[PDB]
Each structure stands twice: as structure tokens, then as C-alpha cells.
Design a protein around this ligand. Structure first.
Ligand SMILES: Cc1cc2nc3c(=O)[nH]c(=O)nc-3n(C[C@H](O)[C@H](O)[C@H](O)COP(=O)(O)OP(=O)(O)OC[C@H]3O[C@@H](n4cnc5c(N)ncnc54)[C@H](O)[C@@H]3O)c2cc1C
Ligand SMILES: *[C@@H]1O[C@H](CO)[C@@H](O)[C@H](O)[C@H]1NC(C)=O
Ligand SMILES: [Cl-]
Length: 467
């Protein structure tokens, strides 16, 4: 209301998290400009065949460990969102042959245990690498080293197990992922190995709404945010920054002045031309932006007239060992979450996401049907009534689903990604110190960014030291 003025570009988890922390400090002259018509960003539900499923984030990841994941108390106590712990203990019983049914439980268990031990060997190696990343390598290189091969898992069952362990977590092959920064993963080290599937008709986005309503005016009857400080359908296109202040222009031609700007748009948006920076960001910052990876994670949802797949103990997750790596390979069924719904979830990432997002929904369903018939021959498997293909990469406001730490990026270079430039500050999961790629990472990153700025506005400490 009176004092420094901060524009916050974007109202996903990090934007809302940041504005909250700024408000708490007494910086209340905030203007949040959100490109879409709602808050929540990559936490977003949608109606699929009469129920509400998540287009974006779906799990609270990292529960039951030595430290409390900040997102978990919100989900499980405050809002009591309907959720289920994901059990992956039975995958060995649930691996399907490209043509002809499941593999022998015993056989798959060996391959799984084998992969697990290579990764444990990777964890030990990781623990010994220098903080500068000087002697870091790709997850694949580590695998090659342990396996004494010129290649990583290269066999239908081994590859889907590989894909399940790594691609299904990070959305890119182990080939491009940094060992030192993903194995082991600070999320699981710090907050615990368990993951909980949010299945509540309110949406995982409730967390963002709840945090938003802590400091933004909401209607007493309705509940809707009515705070003039939050502005929806406001697409930032240009940011002008001087040593004296900043200017933010939106697509509808409005121009706003501020003391500071908090950019919360995804790494992908930063990698696009959507937002122009005048003057252009320095080389150090630009290299940092283009060297990090914005991955794609596609949650394809399907609706059926009847069910034809197993149900019961250990049946929730199952794999398809295609000879074609990452081809419709990780499957989920929702007996618990959406009982009597007849919905399957197949996940695809990276190269297959970009191919699939570009192709017609029909064609995609045709491919999926062909796969499903091979997996369950002699069951009578009906065409899917309905298909949902989330197109995050295509979307100009996201251009992907979450960041991934690539090989060749060290801690210094990652810190350059987060570093402010003048009065322009950065936030988002991709700025998270140890939790990039996650809801909690975005949440904690809003707090961290906000505090760097508060330390400038109030405390007058403005030179930020990259580390
Ligand atoms: C498909 C999917 C699956 C995932 N699964 C998990 C999971 O299960 N568990 C979990 O922990 N994490 C998961 N995540 C990651 C998690 O959702 C994100 O890390 C986190 O929500 C990102 O929040 P953010 O604030 O950093 O970015 P965003 O949510 O993208 O917020 C940025 C906001 O800025 C807006 N915008 C962008 N451009 C502009 C512009 N120029 N003008 C104004 N506004 C702009 C956008 O609309 C957006 O609302 C997943 C992500 C996706 C999408
Ligand atoms: C979540 O909430 C339930 C029901 O209130 C509680 O009994 C359970 O212990 C909680 N789960 C975790 C992992 O904290
Ligand atoms: Cl072997």
C-alpha cells in the first residue's frame, strides 16, 4: 500500500508462495499478473469423463522421512485432501511382454534387484564427487562403469525397468541427467521415500488457493479471490529494468512501474521468446537459462466401457516392456482413487511426448489400443470411449512440465539461473536449491526468492553472490 512496489509475474505455486512471504515481511504493494484465467499454474485439475483428474502435478513426493515436507501438512491435515500412498513393491508381478502377457515374477525381480544395486553403487559414487561438479557424469556413464558395458540397459525388460526408475521420475533419459544432482535425490533423502497420490475433487491446486487466501482478499460468501492485487489474463511480454526501477508491459498493452519484479514463469517460458528483457539479460544468465532442461511429462488418460485389466493387491502400477524404449511403458489403474470409473493412465516423456502432443488424439488412442490388445490378448478389450492428452509443451505459458538437471551443469551454473539481474528477481521450481522439479520445490523457492529481495528493499543488501 505504501513503500516499495513489487510486480510478481505468474501466480502458480512459486508466485503465490513469494507474494505471501513478501506480504508477511510488510511488502504489501504487490501486483500479481497471471497469464491464464486462474491461479495454480502446473497444479491444475480437469474434468475427465465425469470426474476430476490432475493435468499437472499429482503426487506429494517425499513423505515419512527425517524432515517434514512443507506441502504435506497442508495436504494431509489442513485441507485433508483425499490421498493414497503409492506402493511399488509388486512391479515384478506386473511387467508385460511386448507380445504375450506378463513375465515371470521371479525373472523380473532379479532384473529389478540388479538395477537397484547399480543405482546404490551410483549413490556411493555420487557421495564422493567434488562440490564443484568437476568430476560429475551422466546417470548412464555411472551405469556403464558398474555394468562394464559400452551401453546402459538395452533389453526390453531392463529398459522399462530403467525407464521406470529414471525417466518416470525425471522425464528425460539417464543419458542426459546429472548423477551428482539426482542420485540420490534430496527430495527423498530429506523428506522420505514415500509418495502420495492426490485424488480429491477439489484438486491438488487447493494448496495454492489456500496459500493465496492467507493474504489476498476473498469474498465472504463466494470464497473467490477478489483482491485487486491479483490480475488474471495478464500476459507479460516485456520487462524493462534500470538501476532506478522496472517497467512491465502486458500483451493487452498495459505498462506497470515497480521497484522490483519477481519472475515466476517456468524455465521453458524463459527459454522461449514470450518475455522480452530490455536490456537483454547478460551472457552468464542466458547460458544458464539455455543449458538447463525443461522436460515433458505426459499423463495420457483413457476411459473404457468395461474393465479388462487386473485389480487387487499390487495391481495399481504395471509396465509394458516394448522393444522401443519409452513406448507407452508405465501404466496406472485407479481401483482405489476412482472406483468404478474404468480409467487407465499411461505416462510418456521426452521424445514421445513431443511426438504425441503433435499428433491427433485419435491416432494416439489407436496406438494405445494396439498396445493394450497385445498386453491382454484373449481378453475382449473395448476401444476407449474417451482420451485425454495434456499438451504442456505446446502451451506458450508452460513449454514443458518441469526442469531436469542435465550433465555438464554444476552447482555454480545452477546458482546463476536463480541469481537476480538488477531489480529483476527469479523464482520457480527451477530456482529451488535442492528440490527443482517439485511442488515443494516451487513452494520453498518462492520463500527463498522473496527473502533475497526483502533483504534488498529493507536491509539494503543488494549485491547477490553467486556460489
Ligand atoms: C504434468 C506434470 C506432472 C508433475 N508431477 C509432479 C508431482 O506429481 N508432484 C510434484 O511435486 N511435482 C510435480 N510436477 C511439478 C510441479 O507441478 C511444478 O514443479 C510446480 O507446480 C511449478 O510451479 P511454479 O510456480 O514454479 O511454476 P508454474 O506453476 O508454471 O507458475 C508460473 C505461472 O506463471 C504464468 N505465466 C507464465 N508466463 C507468464 C507471462 N509471460 N505472463 C504472466 N504470467 C505468466 C503461468 O500461467 C503459471 O501460472 C509436475 C508438473 C507437471 C505439469
Ligand atoms: C494423514 O492423515 C491421516 C488421517 O488423518 C492420518 O491418520 C495419517 O497418519 C496421515 N498420514 C501421514 C503419512 O502422515
Ligand atoms: Cl545380466
Amino acid at each position: 500500500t505504501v513503500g516499495p512496489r513489487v510486480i510478481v509475474v505468474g501466480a502458480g505455486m512459486s508466485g503465490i508462495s513469494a507474494a505471501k512471504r513478501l506480504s508477511e515481511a510488510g511488502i504489501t504493494d504487490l501486483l500479481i499478473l497471471e497469464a491464464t484465467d486462474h491461479i495454480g499454474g502446473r497444479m491444475h485439475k480437469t474434468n475427465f469423463a465425469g470426474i476430476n483428474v490432475e493435468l499437472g502435478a499429482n503426487w506429494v513426493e517425499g513423505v515419512n522421512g527425517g524432515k517434514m515436507n512443507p506441502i504435506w501438512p497442508i495436504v494431509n491435515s489442513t485441507l485433508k485432501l483425499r490421498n493414497f500412498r503409492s506402493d511399488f513393491d509388486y512391479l515384478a508381478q506386473n511387467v508385460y511382454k511386448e507380445d504375450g502377457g506378463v513375465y515371470d515374477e521371479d525373472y523380473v525381480q532379479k532384473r529389478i534387484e540388479l538395477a537397484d544395486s547399480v543405482e546404490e553403487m551410483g549413490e556411493k559414487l555420487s557421495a564422493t564427487l567434488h562440490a564443484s561438479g568437476r568430476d560429475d557424469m551422466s546417470i548412464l556413464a555411472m551405469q556403464r562403469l558398474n555394468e562394464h558395458q559400452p551401453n546402459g540397459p538395452a533389453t526390453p525388460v531392463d529398459m522399462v525397468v530403467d525407464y521406470y526408475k529414471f525417466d518416470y521420475e525425471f522425464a528425460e533419459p539417464p543419458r542426459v541427467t546429472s548423477l551428482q544432482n539426482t542420485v540420490p535425490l534430496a527430495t527423498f533423502s530429506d523428506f522420505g521415500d514415500d509418495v502420495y497420490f492426490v485424488a480429491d475433487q477439489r484438486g491438488y491446486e487447493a494448496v495454492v488457493y489456500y496459500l493465496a487466501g492467507q493474504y489476498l482478499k476473498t469474498d465472504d460468501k463466494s470464497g473467490k479471490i477478489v483482491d485487486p492485487r491479483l490480475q488474471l489474463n495478464k500476459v507479460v511480454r516485456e520487462i524493462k529494468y534500470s538501476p532506478g526501477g522496472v517497467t512491465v508491459k502486458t500483451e493487452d498493452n498495459s505498462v506497470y512501474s515497480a521497484d522490483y519484479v519477481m519472475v515466476s514463469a517456468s524455465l521453458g517460458v524463459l527459454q522461449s521468446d514470450l518475455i522480452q528483457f530490455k536490456p537483454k539479460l547478460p551472457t552468464w544468465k542466458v547460458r544458464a537459462i539455455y543449458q538447463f532442461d525443461m522436460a515433458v511429462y505426459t499423463m495420457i488418460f483413457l476411459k473404457f466401457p468395461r474393465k479388462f485389466w487386473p485389480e487387487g493387491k499390487g495391481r495399481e502400477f504395471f509396465l509394458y516392456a516394448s522393444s522401443r524404449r519409452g513406448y507407452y511403458g508405465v501404466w496406472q489403474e485407479f481401483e482405489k482413487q476412482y472406483p468404478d470409473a474404468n480409467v487407465l493412465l499411461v505416462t510418456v516423456t521426452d521424445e514421445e511426448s513431443r511426438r504425441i502432443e503433435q499428433q491427433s488424439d485419435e491416432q494416439t488412442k489407436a496406438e494405445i489400443m494396439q498396445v493394450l490388445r497385445k498386453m491382454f490378448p484373449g481378453k475382449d478389450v473395448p476401444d476407449a470411449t474417451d482420451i485425454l492428452v495434456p499438451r504442456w509443451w505446446s502451451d506458450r505459458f508452460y513449454k514443458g512440465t518441469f526442469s531436469n538437471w542435465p550433465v555438464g551443469v554444476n552447482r555454480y551454473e545452477y546458482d546463476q539461473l536463480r541469481a537476480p539481474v538488477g531489480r529483476v528477481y527469479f523464482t520457480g521450481e527451477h530456482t529451488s536449491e535442492h528440490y527443482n522439479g517439485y511442488v515443494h520445490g516451487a513452494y520453498l523457492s518462492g520463500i527463498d526468492s522473496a527473502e533475497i529481495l526483502i533483504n534488498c528493499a529493507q536491509k539494503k543488501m543488494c549485491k547477490y553472490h553467486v556460489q
